[PDB]
């Protein structure tokens, strides 16, 4: 439906999701130090979220559309 690009810079968490049909939001939580981000936008935009940045760690990537 869109373009999802999730990665992990072994230290931080980033999530970029594009959408040109309906609203979309990219949420990413850093489960290590207690970080959290989100880049909510409308239709036609690049939602890039970022959080954390230190060393290897887990993260929670979420997304949606409306």
UniProtKB/TrEMBL annotation:
It comes from the Bacteria. The keyword Signal applies. Keywords: Plasmid, Signal. The keyword Transmembrane helix does not apply. This is Lactococcin 972. It comes from Lactococcus lactis subsp. lactis (Streptococcus lactis). The chain holds residues 26 to 91 of 91 of the full protein.
